[PDB]
């Protein structure tokens, strides 16, 4: 009757995006964006959604569900695909929310980026940051480039994700992915060991934290490709905001190292298309022998002057004049209202 | 003799609004708005009201009762209903004050609002703030609209309350409520996870804090209905006061986003009626294609001009001329003495 | 079939720097800095790389691999040498990465370099850069020359390593080795103090960082032998790439200093031999009274013209025509395909 394994069964049979559990009702599934209860067999679930979720979570999580009130992880049913969970305490009762998790990475061209980006995958070392606010598909972007490298290069790529969003497959390069919580205790020692595990390209999952950044750099400056990601909105925001988490005693010193090992900043945002709702906008900065010196000498909005690689607003004008995004959706995601409408 | 469970017994038997404990007397109950001690059995309670309260509170509260001098939570006697507590140190001694939390939800019509409000519940996304000073029944209002959605729409509503005022019941939508203190550590991470728990409508319980607001927006502008609530008195106060908690570096940029994802502001206040004392007054602003542009260009009391959706004073004239509120109770709650009495 | 002992067998036979296991593929080995799967016998390894690594680790480690998600240790196969392991949890699965500890120091002749190199050890001061990609034995090279000086000269040598690869023994010279992490906080202050500790020969461990380079120079130009090492591939790459990490305000000024204190650049790579897999290829530039002026006046590929001390491709033709490396392994490691095959 009430076996998680079998509520997933009727979830992808009904062609589902999500499953949702709660105490007072029977198991629910989202189809299309409307929610229907498949009372079909699962009954109005007891207080013992407890037992159901508990059966998916490792020991490491069912501890963490007591410390805080929620956990965020990913498990696989070898039967179908892998999922992304989120168990949480509700009204003294347990409840979860399982998503579908992409099985194919998308090929790089369908993304809507130039090739001077794909070109970054050919570097020998440095930082490649892919910033952007949650649900801007930065993983989607990363996943692409990394895979491109997976096929193209004889490499040993290593990713320290939270959680593993895409599974990588087996080509020319050999790919270790380490989910946090599951397979390491923290981004901290997870990276720090990565640095000894003899890697080619390292993917520091998120750089929230001073110590992470620290080595993430120390790793890029030392023979490896370091793909980082963040939550800043523009290029010059990013490179402010990573230097802003240092003690300013030496703060300068990073700006310099950064203006040698910075190899690409790509801020992103996902928008509603005129068609099927799927279109991406971006700002793109790949440092050339010129831009380097600017950053060295702190002179930043002097780099904003020099962006024409390509500003954010600029990739909205080139997007709206082709009739893909509304004159009102893009005067919304755009940092500066001023730098367009003139266009 | 002195069992909490049994003091609640004689509390709803006597038909009570409140129970009150203190050290120097016996257990007290409010009936009607006068307080009588049911010395009936409970004796002049010792210093060990300690034991009585201690028996209701989770570990999480009896810690917090040491950090500060008080705690604010809610527990349930399945035997009758649920209650709202408030244990607090007094004169080196313990004391509490238990209310009855309600047991429906009122149907939206009994409230005294128009249906252009209830229409908000049909939006696809955005902010709907329901401001108003404590004991103006903003949870009451909320609870209504949310429940309206609970029945009408096939939805996954999530609320992050403090405390849970109304329990939601089980219809077309599936409803998680998360009491803070009890089920999460802070409005902060409680929301921040809600954003992952695949929600349709989110209810950020109060918007006191810069970081809360931040995501509350970021969630509205991204496909969800975000009900907020505050303590401001008029519409233009609200939309000043949320922008006023930002750093003005970018302050402008919120005003804009706000004039696209603002979908309704409803300030409220509760007044004494000529009959049973129960009548509500409100100010109502639902942005149309015109009002949008005003807020975009900072031009605010130009929206005050344009209010006739409907001003506060205005919903006092239409209230007193029908003979429900006194000429002196409403020149009291009204922001501006000027804009009436002329009427 | 799947015996660790025998995957090491085929690892040093093919002439390997590293072995790498993972779940979704067959055992991998790095040769030269490219990764190839010897599907030869070991099959697409199961989830039971578990069993393989488990067979190397003491009890003390297989405990620690549960506490954290990784462990870093060292075991010996008495059959060959000793290794450096790093087992770590990956995607719910085990994985490892074994390197190759020589703990001997090899006598300089077995290396396969001329004596005009060994002659550098007789200089009074300058930079001696030993560039080359990970697993090209640059420490092996270094260690040699340093030891040669250890026995030959009455000196105080000091190395700032990460980690200490070879232990130096006690002869005519007195040898301090400073492991980073263990015995100092950073290459930064570790060097910076080495400059006061009265040294004869200083070995700056890697030159990733603008400040390191700075002093590493300032030390060479002031009475000491400064052995540096990098990750560049050819000579002219090296001397671009260290000047490239300076601000170009003065950038010129290093090129000059460099064309006085540059004493030898030796780029390296390790290749699979026709016999036991152990053969090294190199490019060699020891500046004479002529080459100095060229670098002074920026004129670089004019030095490339003047290399015949000896080009990289050149040390592949003199290697393949003797029948030690394949016509296809060396048209792989070679920077330029053009400058050979004609030969
Ligand atoms: N029209 C009405 N019908 C029934 N109850 C009302 C009405 N107006 C006000 N009340 C009462 O006022 C009280 C305070 O409101 P409540 O929503 O609990 O607080 P808040 O102002 O903090 O949101 C409630 O107990 C509620 O029942």
For B300, counting Cβ atoms within 10 Å of its Cβ (0-12 exposed, 13-18 middle, 19+ buried), the class is: middle
Residue C126: closest CA among C202, C177, C232: C202
What are phi and psi for residue B253, nearest 5 degrees?
A: -65, -15
Resolution stated for this PDB structure, in Å: 4.2
Distance B140 CA to ligand 1 centre (A): 6
Q: b/e string for B79-112 if b means 16 or more Cβ within 10 A?
A: eeebbbbbbbebeebbbbbbbbbbeebeebeebe
Residue C242 to residue C228: CA distance in whole angstroms: 11
| Residue indicated by tokens 């396969």 | C112
Residue C107 to residue C141: CA distance in whole angstroms: 10
Label the pairing between strands C96-101 and B201-204: unpaired
CA–CA distance from C278 to each of B101, C12, C117 (Å)?
A: 81, 8, 20
Reported residue count of chain B is 343
For A94, counting Cβ atoms within 10 Å of its Cβ (0-12 exposed, 13-18 middle, 19+ buried), the class is: buried
Number of neighbouring beta carbons within 10 Å of residue C288 = 9
DSSP category for residue C180:
B
C77 in helix, strand or coil? coil
Q: Which two tokens stand for residue C279?
A: 């053969």
Q: Which two tokens stand for residue B333?
A: 């709650």
What are phi and psi for residue A282, nearest 5 degrees?
A: -150, 160
Separation in Å, CA of A59 to nearest CA in chain C:
12
DSSP category for residue A107:
P
Surface of C (87-106) touching A: CB under 8 A: 88-92, 95, 97, 99
A198 contact C CB<8A:
yes
Residue C71: closest CA among B153, A57, A184: A184
Assess contact for C182 and C140: CB atoms under 8 A. Answer: no
Distance B278 CA to ligand 1 centre (A): 8
Q: What is the 3-state secondary structure (H, E, C) of chain B?
A: CCCHHHHCHHHHHCCCCEEECCCCCCCEEEEECEEEECCCCCCCCCCCHHHHHHCCCCHHHHHHHHHCCECCCEEECCCCCEEECCCEECCCCEECEEEECCCCCCCHHHHCCCHHHHCHHHCCCEEEECCCCCCCCHHHHHHHHHHHHHHHCCCEEEEECCCCCCCCCCCCCEEEECCECCCECCHHHHHHHHCCCCCCEEEECCCCCHHHHHHHHHHHCCCCEEEECCCCCCHHHHHHHCHHHCCCCCCHHHHHHHHHHEEEEEEEEEECCCCCCCEEEEEEECCCHHHHHHHHCCCCHHHHHCCCCECCCHHHHHHHCCCCCCCCCHHHHCCCCCCCCCC
Q: Which two tokens stand for residue B245?
A: 């908690």
Chain A contact set for B178 (CB, 8 A): 69, 88-91
Assess contact for C2 and C44: CB atoms under 8 A. Answer: no
Residue A205 to residue C334: CA distance in whole angstroms: 35
Distance B106 CA to ligand 1 centre (A): 10
Residue A8 to residue A55: CA distance in whole angstroms: 13
| Residue indicated by tokens 């550098």 | C120
Q: Which of B111, B140, B279, B325 to mutate to test the pocket of ligand 1 (most atoms within 8 A of CB)?
A: B140
C147-151 long-range contacts, CB within 8 A, separation 24+: C147/C105, C147/C108, C148/C108, C148/C118, C148/C121, C149/C121, C149/C173, C149/C201, C150/C175
* Chain centre distance of CA B248: 29
Q: Which two tokens stand for residue B242?
A: 């949320």
C240 in helix, strand or coil? helix
Residue C219: closest CA among C180, C170, C266, C263: C263
Q: Do B154 and A35 touch (CB under 8 A)?
A: yes
Separation in Å, CA of C254 to nearest CA in chain A:
16
A343 in helix, strand or coil? coil
Residue B192 to residue A134: CA distance in whole angstroms: 11
A154 contact B CB<8A:
no
H or E element that contains A201:
strand A201-204
| Beta-bridge mates of residue C225 | C126, C201
Mutation pick from C20, C208, C229 vs chain A, by most beta carbons of A within 10 Å, is: C208
Chains A and C touch (3+ CB pairs under 8 A): yes
- The tally of CA atoms less than 13 A away on the side-chain side of residue A211 is 7
Residue C276 to residue B38: CA distance in whole angstroms: 97
Residue A14: closest CA among A27, A23, A1: A27
DSSP per-residue string spanning C86-103: --B--SSS--EEEEEE--
Whether the bond into C163 is cis, omega within 30 of 0:
yes
A196 in helix, strand or coil? coil
Chain A contact set for C248 (CB, 8 A): 293
Residue B243 to residue C85: CA distance in whole angstroms: 55
Reported residue count of chain C is 343
Residue B262: closest CA among B307, B318, B317, B217: B217
Residue B207 to residue B219: CA distance in whole angstroms: 14
DSSP category for residue A105:
P
List all residues 6 or more positions away from A318 whose beta carbon is below 8 Å from its beta carbon. Answer: none
List all residues 6 or more positions away from C279 whose beta carbon is below 8 Å from its beta carbon. Answer: C15, C112, C270, C271, C272, C273, C319, C324, C325
Minimal Cβ distance to A90: which of B154, B170, B183: B183
A237 in helix, strand or coil? helix
Q: b/e string for A304-337 if b means 16 or more Cβ within 10 A?
A: eeebebbbbbbbbbebbeeebbeeebbbbbbbee
Residue A262 to residue A282: CA distance in whole angstroms: 18
Q: How many degrees, rounded to 5, is the angle at CA C237 between CA C236 and CA C243?
A: 95
Residue C206: closest CA among C241, C157, C249: C241
Q: Which two tokens stand for residue B323?
A: 């003979």
Surface of A (15-54) touching B: CB under 8 A: 18, 20, 22, 24-25, 28, 30, 34-37
Q: Is the CB of B181 under 6 A from ligand 1?
A: no
Breaks (C-N over 2.5 A) in chain B follow: 308
Using CA of residue A133, residue A139, residue A140, residue A145, what is the dihedral sign?
A: positive
Q: Is the CB of B136 under 6 A from ligand 1?
A: yes
C246-251 long-range contacts, CB within 8 A, separation 24+: C246/C210, C247/A256, C247/A293, C247/A296, C247/A297, C248/A293, C249/A293
Assess contact for C84 and C101: CB atoms under 8 A. Answer: yes
Q: Do A190 and C69 touch (CB under 8 A)?
A: yes
Residue A48 to residue B15: CA distance in whole angstroms: 36
Residue C180 to residue A306: CA distance in whole angstroms: 41
A80 in helix, strand or coil? coil
A63 in helix, strand or coil? helix
Question: If you compute the radius of gyration of chain B from its CA atoms, what whole number of angstroms results?
Answer: 22
A178 contact C CB<8A:
yes
């Amino acid at each position: 009757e009430l076996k998680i394994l079998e509520i997933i069964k009727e979830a992808i049979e009904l062609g589902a995006s999500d499953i949702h559990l709660t105490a007072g009702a029977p198991p629910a599934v989202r189809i299309d964006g409307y929610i229907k209860f498949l009372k079909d067999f699962p009954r109005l679930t007891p207080e013992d959604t407890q037992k159901l979720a508990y059966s998916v979570m490792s020991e490491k999580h069912r501890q963490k569900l007591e410390e805080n009130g929620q956990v965020d992880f990913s498990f696989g049913v070898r039967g179908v695909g892998r999922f992304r969970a989120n168990v949480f305490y509700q009204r003294g009762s347990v409840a979860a929310a399982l998503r579908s998790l992409p099985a194919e990475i998308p090929e790089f061209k369908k993304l809507g980026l130039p090739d001077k980006v794909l070109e970054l995958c050919h570097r020998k070392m440095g930082l490649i940051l892919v910033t952007g606010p949650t649900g801007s598909g930065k993983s989607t972007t990363i996943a692409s480039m990394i895979d491109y490298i997976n096929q193209t290069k004889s490499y040993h790529i290593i990713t320290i994700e939270d959680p593993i969003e895409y599974v990588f497959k087996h080509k020319k390069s050999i790919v270790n992915q380490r989910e946090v919580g599951e397979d390491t205790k923290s981004f901290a020692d997870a990276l720090r060991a990565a640095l000894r595990e003899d890697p080619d390209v390292i993917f520091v999952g998120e750089m929230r934290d001073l110590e992470t950044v620290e080595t993430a750099l120390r790793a890029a400056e030392t023979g490896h490709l370091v793909f980082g990601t963040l939550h800043t909105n523009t290029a010059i925001d990013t490179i402010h905001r990573i230097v802003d988490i240092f003690p300013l005693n030496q703060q300068e010193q990073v700006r310099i190292v950064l203006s040698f090992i910075l190899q690409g900043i790509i801020s992103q945002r996902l928008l509603p298309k005129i068609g099927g709702g799927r279109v991406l906008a971006y700002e793109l900065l790949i440092p050339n022998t010129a831009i380097r010196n600017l950053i060295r000498e702190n002179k930043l909005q002097q780099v904003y002057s020099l962006m024409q690689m390509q500003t954010m607003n600029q990739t909205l004008y080139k997007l709206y004049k082709q009739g893909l995004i509304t004159l009102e959706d893009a005067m919304e995601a755009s940092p500066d209202p001023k730098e367009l409408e003139r266009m």
